[PDB]
Design a binder for this molecule. Structure first.
Ligand code: NI
Length: 341
């Protein structure tokens, strides 16, 4: 049944709660972003109002065939009224179209649901700075101090320099980038840009990217694989078997693959610097795992919460075990005592 942490008290609202059937007493279903653990259950047969960003509403219509009359897209950074309650959508710094939601309850409580986010200091100068937040529904994916990772910028720098070196040394090398959802587009687009190529992909993935309002997108992507030296493939195919296979398909146009797997965190983060990342190589195939995260590091999350000073925190990730729950609650108390709220 619908967990409490998907329900917004004092409203008839739910957040990312599409897999429970009809939630009893829910008059509006918010969707923070287009990732499957969050949209699970939406289809053309859904007949309740869904509130979301423009981008997320393009994906609902075009990819899941939700009928237009049930999609209620909202502009960002704008006070809007939904079933008599003031709300604001803010950028979540996650994937394209991902939002955080501010709810201004009739009784005077203010609630921020982060959806999935990567906390950033730029958030300290949105509409959040203007008033106090009593309850925080927090993306806790990496709420433990072992989770450090580089900035997105340092990671993209590493990838651009690696790819550019490899292809200038060998103009017959192919670059492959793995994907399984939206998000992380900068990886493959930045690499294609430095190489003077478009990114070649399947028709289903090209359709997905055309929903996202990226500027100049017709200039960076294509479904003609033959004319491209940066190919996007399902993350499942980013392994030695899958890449040998794919290489055979290119018909002797290429004699080497350099592949990128942008993971979340992986334990080499505890030791290794970005400068010091190396591939796994077999034959004429190399695979780089790069730590491109679209969730907060532990330290980014701590800063955000210590700035915001909420009165109550409700975790939305890693809530299924007692040892996780208990550990998270201990960090929340540490942060509150160190900062004095
Ligand atoms: Ni997500």
């Amino acid at each position: 049944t619908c967990p409490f942490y998907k329900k917004i008290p004092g409203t008839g609202f739910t957040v990312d709660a599409f897999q429970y059937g009809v939630v009893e007493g829910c008059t509006a279903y918010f969707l923070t972003h287009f990732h499957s653990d969050h949209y699970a259950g939406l289809s053309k047969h859904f007949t309740f109002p869904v509130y979301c960003s423009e981008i997320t509403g393009n994906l609902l219509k075009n990819k899941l065939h939700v009928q237009e009359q049930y999609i209620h897209p909202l502009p960002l950074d704008t006070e809007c009224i939904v079933n008599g309650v003031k709300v604001v959508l803010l950028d979540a710094n996650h994937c394209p179209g991902a939002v955080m939601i501010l709810f201004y309850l009739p009784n005077g409580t203010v609630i921020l649901h982060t959806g999935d986010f990567r906390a950033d200091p730029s958030m300290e100068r949105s509409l959040l700075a203007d008033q106090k937040v009593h309850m925080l529904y927090l993306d806790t994916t990496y709420c433990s101090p072992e989770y450090t990772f580089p900035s997105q910028q340092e990671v993209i720098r590493f990838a651009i320099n690696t790819a550019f070196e490899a292809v200038t040394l060998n103009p017959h090398a192919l670059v492959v980038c793995g994907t399984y959802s939206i998000g992380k587009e900068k990886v493959f687009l930045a690499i294609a840009d430095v190489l003077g190529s478009k990114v070649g992909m399947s028709q289903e993935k090209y359709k997905t990217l055309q929903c996202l309002n990226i500027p100049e997108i017709n200039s960076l992507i294509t479904t003609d694989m033959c004319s491209s030296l940066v190919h996007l493939l399902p993350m499942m195919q980013i392994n030695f078997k899958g890449l040998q296979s794919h290489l055979k398909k290119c018909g002797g146009k290429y004699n080497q693959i350099l592949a990128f797997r942008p993971t979340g965190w992986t334990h080499s983060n505890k030791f290794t610097r970005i400068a010091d990342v190396i591939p796994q190589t077999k034959g004429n195939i190399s695979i780089y795992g790069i730590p491109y995260s679209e969730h907060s590091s532990y330290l980014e999350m701590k800063r955000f919460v210590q700035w915001l000073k909420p009165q109550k925190i409700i975790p939305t990730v890693n809530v299924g075990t007692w040892k996780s729950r208990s550990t998270m609650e201990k960090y929340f108390r540490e942060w509150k005592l160190e900062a004095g709220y």
